[PDB]
Design a protein around this ligand. Structure first.
Ligand SMILES: *[C@@H]1O[C@H](CO)[C@@H](O[C@@H]2O[C@H](CO)[C@@H](O[C@@H]3O[C@H](CO)[C@@H](O)[C@H](O)[C@@H]3O)[C@H](O)[C@H]2NC(C)=O)[C@H](O)[C@H]1NC(C)=O
Ligand SMILES: *[C@@H]1O[C@H](CO)[C@@H](O[C@@H]2O[C@H](CO)[C@@H](O[C@@H]3O[C@H](CO)[C@@H](O)[C@H](O)[C@@H]3O)[C@H](O)[C@H]2NC(C)=O)[C@H](O)[C@H]1NC(C)=O
Ligand SMILES: *[C@@H]1O[C@H](CO[C@H]2O[C@@H](C)[C@@H](O)[C@@H](O)[C@@H]2O)[C@@H](O[C@@H]2O[C@H](CO)[C@@H](O)[C@H](O)[C@H]2NC(C)=O)[C@H](O)[C@H]1NC(C)=O
Ligand SMILES: *[C@@H]1O[C@H](CO)[C@@H](O[C@@H]2O[C@H](CO)[C@@H](O)[C@H](O)[C@H]2NC(C)=O)[C@H](O)[C@H]1NC(C)=O
Ligand SMILES: *[C@H]1O[C@H](CO[C@H]2O[C@@H](C)[C@@H](O)[C@@H](O)[C@@H]2O)[C@@H](O)[C@H](O)[C@H]1NC(C)=O
Ligand code: NAG
Ligand code: CA
Ligand code: CA
Ligand code: CA
Ligand code: CA
Ligand code: CU
Ligand code: CU
Lengths: 705, 705
């Protein structure tokens, strides 16, 4: 019966956000508009979020005990009501009650930010739909009545980038049936429209091209005419149906409950604000609006391993029979991995008994909002030994330890993909960063196999690749680190005790990587089997104290350099790169690359620049991804099984021995001892320990927009 | 509130039945393996002989009668002018009447006697020699360095010599540590024992290695010690920490997470057969080959006829002779034969279903390994699939992932190998293997860094690679299958609507692999990103029904072909290979390769022989492995974290849609609906469903030998 239970990196709070918005409205001139109903020629505030502190100061505070650096915020402002409109980046502080505001644009980017680089606003999307649905589609209502039950029952979906050339803002939009309670993405009606929305005055916006069921037209006029002329043979795309194409609700009623996990003697970790603490682990967590999930000041048994691990960008490159598909290259940070974090459904997205946590933000609005259950944090019994030995030889003993990990997770739903961002903390001292793609695939109307598979009636599942970039600022036993590569080789040799014979002598090769360029591994290149970052200092046995990067990635072929667009996500070309850490190089991407990748705001390749990486504060940049050719089993959704991709950070002579030796949960007993004796073996007391019904919270869901 | 066996391993009776029959028909002269000497006649092994496929299938599908249930016996025929090992098929069970020598049929000639595995008694005899005859000759030295006075133990290596016919084995000497691994306590002495002679009296010691130097005999070593040329390095007898212990110095804290089935378990085990809602298969263990599964059926339909471990391999490098020539072909010892008991709540989850294995190896009566297998459902704490829609329609639809696992563990000397087969709700099968347990060590001398890392006082952790081979006989939608490779490519192109501009057009490349040699991928070769086996027949959307092999492997560089030994495990050279399935090609290895790899009994490369694989019964052969350079954190044991290696088998247009759409456990609800309303959302009723204390069984352990 019955059964128990330094925030310098925290994301800005409701107050802090409000505080900065007040200060902005005051100091920014009226004509300021609510971003959420702004127009191109308006002035407004697009985003307000935490500006991360410099490392030197942050550390001085965390370690040396000096005072905290100014807590600041960064605001992105669209300045439209202006002869030469610009986007500007403004640092506002110091919180909790700000007094200054500095334009860092020219500092950071060496010049103004072109207005065309700004992300398409929510209002801008609405205006575009007004044009399409009021001014444009009616011109073809003859056709639409015949194919598409026109009478409102159709929806548009954006693509990106928006044109062919720096400056452009023309966007292809596909049209789909507005299915109810299920993904529309699988119901392309066959029509795409090239909208030019560069003009500051929506009245001047035009439609450059039209694609319909396999053919280009110049206007909806033509397309309607040609349909009327009788040289457009409409194949009828249905409005309605049943199965996974049409639904997510299963036709099969609940059977017996699946397995459930619980903490029989209370949870073994705490979350206070942005800070998690456990027996072994300590870190602060959070979300960049655009860059997405991040962790800081990660400490294993009190000692810092990493200053920062943050998602940096995500990328989806498509191919297709149609214009939308065949030119789409989402640089998802230009929308926002944080901005589009969705709530975590208890018992689906994370285990029911996880600790859920809310996120607060201020984006494209005046008042801050909240995503409820944005994060989840929990311990998972992996059902699998961290370590184990059974000795039947000479001495009869057993010694092992079941693996229980600590997880932190957010999910981003950008249009149809749901990205899943795991950071898993292992009891061995290892950190694992994973990401899964799930959700709906993106589809096109089907009209010879070069561009994907047919996944349902009239539907091409368009081929594409996923990839993601991570900043990993390890500070292994201090700031000053070196990069080591180790591998294997065989060397023919006469057998010492019988030289008439030949043996193949297995050996270890070892090289220190001295310059940045030697630590930059292009995709498709051979990669050292052991690569690690290490300190000057050694462990008990005289080896440099190291942490090793090990990669789980099936990376797709990158967009060719021959493409002008590529410089906008040049990180795609590397598997891994280690560079000097620098304040002026905080990120591999920028929210402004999505709309102008031809003139990238940040260009990652520039960071790799022929310097020493021999004894500096280093930072590793890891790419992970894969190629996806959709298939029937992606309908309704793509499963996560086998699609996880990422990397491990594992200790390599960092410790003097395996930390888990002194685990509070390790089991050990001799063959002559009594394995059922509770005092001998803790597992024997488990049935007492766990003789209680768990107190499960009432199911709540974090709602919608 | 509380909460066809046509593939089954032979039972106690069947084993007894066969041994009785063998005793009778094998003439007198027949000794018990545990007592046998080289010149004796004895029965080494009795285990299931797997049925032919055509007959097995006829029974399983067409309903015809079962094929004869038979057994295979390995017999050592020593009491003979020309001694041989012979393979004998005995049947039909339950009460056998015949017995057929298949040796010459199968291997095209007699099995040389020197290929036989070293018997337990043979190991004991060898120790008599060492400890009675030999070591006393160097007791002067041994008293000085090693607390000689019995307190030392030997460990074998393999293969045994330099050339087909040889049977000389290096044995290292270690302190017989109590209740912890001896493997970390090499005293610095290895002895080359020649035990080829049928008369142990004639066995000799060809060489001696001590603390860095070679001697012809123990006479020599002692003569040279007493002559003042051998400088002993005292290796301690005793100590504390992970070098010496597996018992933690830290007392139990609060219990870790525990998983349970709140409305009963959702699978059954009847004998060798598992059944669940989705999955159906028979499981078991080959004495030598190890874990295997048969007649795997997703929702009633066969995906795989057989998935079986085939061989495991550990290739070493080192400063000393044992380390530098060791190549364990573990099947020559036996992955089943050395299955250890699974400790409840360490090796598998506490509430797993544990199952015993019966065997008859190197003895006259059958024995049992208690809790050899475990079978359980695991909540992965991670969604199989999920979508959150804030866009146009407000809905959520997902499904938490619960997998079905089957696991055994083999402890071969120091390593404990974990063998997972995980069955996913998506229709995917996953085969994993982890290496844990103790590393193998050597005494540390010399300044090279070429052969590993120092992991404790005076201990070299010797570099080596692990690898494992699996037979995967998929029968995708029937027997007749083809092999497909798909990948990606970019193709420059004029932008259709703006030909002044260039786009990189992503496309899918596809190729049918026609001949065996085209499906044979060497290690280090580029591999198609999508490789699958498929049927002639298509799904609803016209694509061939496929299952795809996706590989999680960090494979080490293979032993060079230049080595005569290599032919004994030539599968090591491939990542993957598809060949025609053939009755006369049942296995990629043989228990007789370990001792004569120079004249291999089975040579895998011979299977790949320039035939069609276009529309035959095909079988894939997957290699997985990795390089291990030991480091401090391998002491006391190597952890499983990130060391799992294996592959997935995923449906690729096999179905018409994701079968998890019709999951009994999928959650779905619209934003306008009530997510707490139990009738709407099953997760809401969970706190009722799981308001009960679990009835945990009293802890038992399966004991030792
Ligand atoms: C990008 O656009 C922003 C928005 O217009 C520009 O900010 C404004 O720049 C001028 C400085 O050239 C400032 O106003 C001026 O104030 C001084 C006295 O303080 C006076 O000489 C002038 O009569 C004028 O009013 C003001 O700092 C600033 N306004 C706001 C609301 O921030 C920005 O400079 C543009 N920058 C680039 C590089 O494009
Ligand atoms: C490997 O070793 C075994 C040692 O027994 C050989 O098997 C034996 O082969 C002999 C033939 O030399 C069989 O004897 C035959 O049966 C009757 C017994 O009444 C005998 O009088 C006949 O004249 C005939 O020689 C014996 O049955 C058989 N035993 C078994 C278990 O097979 C075997 O030949 C050897 N194999 C090879 C390939 O060298
Ligand atoms: C690890 O290096 C520290 C720090 O190293 C600086 O010394 C330069 C020669 C060069 O190596 C530079 O990269 C490196 O950052 C060593 O201590 C330093 O040692 C010097 C002696 O040469 C002293 O005079 C300095 O006070 C001290 N400087 C600092 C900044 O600490 C240290 O010896 C070494 N330790 C090991 C085990 O390698
Ligand atoms: C080697 O050392 C082991 C470890 O002590 C000895 O194991 C003990 O042996 C005695 C005698 O049989 C038993 O009563 C104890 O219960 C054993 N302990 C364990 C943990 O098994 C073993 O006997 C020694 N082997 C030798 C000397 O060869
Ligand atoms: C697929 O093949 C089946 C018969 O297979 C043989 O037929 C020949 C044309 C030759 O290609 C052989 O190699 C084949 O193995 C046939 O009976 C099936 O119905 C066929 N079905 C389809 C849809 O292709
Ligand atoms: C989806 O359906 C309803 C019509 O019942 C509509 O109000 C909604 O907005 C549709 N999507 C649109 C209009 O974009
Ligand atoms: Ca660093
Ligand atoms: Ca740099
Ligand atoms: Ca087959
Ligand atoms: Ca063949
Ligand atoms: Cu995808
Ligand atoms: Cu290993």
């Amino acid at each position: 019966p019955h059964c128990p239970s330094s925030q310098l990196f925290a994301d800005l709070s409701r107050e802090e956000l409000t505080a900065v918005m007040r200060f902005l409205t005051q100091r920014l001139g009226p004509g300021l508009v609510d971003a959420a109903q702004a127009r191109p020629s308006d002035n407004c505030v697009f985003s307000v979020e935490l500006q991360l502190p410099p490392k030197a100061a942050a550390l001085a505070h965390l370690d040396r005990g000096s005072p905290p650096p100014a807590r600041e915020a960064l605001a992105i402002v669209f300045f439209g009501r202006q002869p030469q409109p610009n986007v500007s980046e403004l640092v506002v502080g110091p919180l909790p009650h700000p007094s200054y505001m500095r334009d860092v644009t020219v500092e950071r980017h060496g010049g103004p930010l072109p207005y065309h680089r700004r992300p398409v606003l929510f209002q801008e999307y609405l205006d575009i739909d007004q044009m399409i649905f009021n001014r444009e589609l009616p011109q073809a209502s003859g056709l639409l009545h015949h194919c598409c039950f026109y009478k409102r029952n159709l929806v548009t979906m954006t693509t990106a980038p928006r044109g062919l050339q720096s400056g452009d803002r023309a966007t292809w939009f596909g049209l789909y049936y507005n299915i109810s309670g299920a993904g529309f993405f699988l119901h392309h009606v066959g029509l795409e429209l090239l909208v030019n929305h560069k003009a500051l005055d929506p009245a001047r916006w035009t439609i450059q091209k039209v694609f319909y069921q396999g053919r280009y037209y110049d206007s909806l006029a033509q397309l309607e005419a040609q349909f009327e002329a009788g040289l457009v043979n409409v194949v009828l795309i249905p409005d309605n149906g049943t199965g996974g194409s049409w639904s997510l609700k299963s036709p099969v009623p609940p059977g017996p409950a699946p397995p459930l996990q619980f903490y029989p003697q209370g949870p073994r970790f705490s979350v206070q604000g942005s800070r998690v603490a456990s027996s072994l682990w300590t870190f602060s967590f959070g979300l960049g609006a655009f860059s997405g999930p991040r962790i800081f000041d990660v400490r294993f048994q009190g000692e810092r391993l990493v200053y920062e691990i943050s998602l940096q960008e995500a990328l989806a490159i498509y191919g297709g029979n149609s214009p939308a598909a065949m030119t789409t290259r989402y640089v998802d940070g230009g929308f926002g991995m944080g901005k589009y974090t969705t709530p975590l459904t208890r018992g689906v997205d994370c285990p029911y008994l996880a600790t859920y946590v809310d996120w607060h933000f201020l984006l494209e609005s005046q008042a801050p909002k909240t995503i409820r259950d944005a994060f989840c944090v929990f311990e998972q019994n992996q059902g699998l030994p961290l370590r184990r030995h059974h000795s039947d030889l000479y001495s009869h003993y057993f010694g092992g330890l079941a693996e229980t990990v600590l997880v932190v997770r957010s999910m981003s739903t950008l249009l149809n993909y749901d990205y899943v961002w795991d950071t898993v903390f292992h009891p061995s001292g290892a950190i694992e960063i994973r990401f899964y793609a799930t959700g709906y695939i993106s589809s096109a109307f089907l009209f010879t196999g070069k561009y994907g598979n047919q996944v349902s009636e009239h539907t091409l599942g368009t081929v594409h690749t996923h990839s993601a970039h991570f900043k990993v600022d390890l500070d292994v036993a201090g700031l000053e680190n070196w990069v080591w590569a180790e591998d294997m080789v065989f060397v023919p040799m006469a057998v010492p005790w019988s030289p008439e014979h030949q043996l193949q002598r297995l050996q270890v090769t070892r090289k220190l990587l001295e310059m940045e360029e030697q630590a930059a591994f292009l995709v498709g290149s051979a990669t050292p089997r052991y690569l690690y970052l290490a300190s000057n200092h050694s462990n008990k046995w005289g080896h440099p104290r190291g942490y090793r990067i090990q990669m789980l990635s099936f990376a797709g072929e990158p967009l060719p350099q021959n493409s002008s667009m590529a410089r906008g996500f040049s990180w795609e070309r590397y598997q891994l790169a280690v560079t000097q850490r620098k304040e002026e190089e905080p990120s591999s991407s920028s929210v402004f690359n999505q709309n102008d990748p031809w003139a990238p705001t940040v260009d990652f390749s520039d960071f790799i620049n022929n310097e020493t990486i021999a004894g500096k504060d280093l930072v590793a940049w890891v790419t992970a991804g894969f190629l996806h050719i959709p298939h029937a089993e992606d309908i309704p959704n793509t499963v996560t099984v086998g699609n996880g991709v990422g990397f491990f950070l594992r200790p390599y002579n960092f410790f003097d021995e395996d930390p888990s030796f002194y685990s509070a949960d390790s089991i050990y007993f001799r063959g002559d001892q009594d394995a059922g004796a509770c005092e001998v073996n803790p597992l024997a007391c488990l049935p007492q320990a766990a003789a209680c019904a768990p107190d499960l919270p009432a199911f709540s869901h974090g709602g919608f927009s």
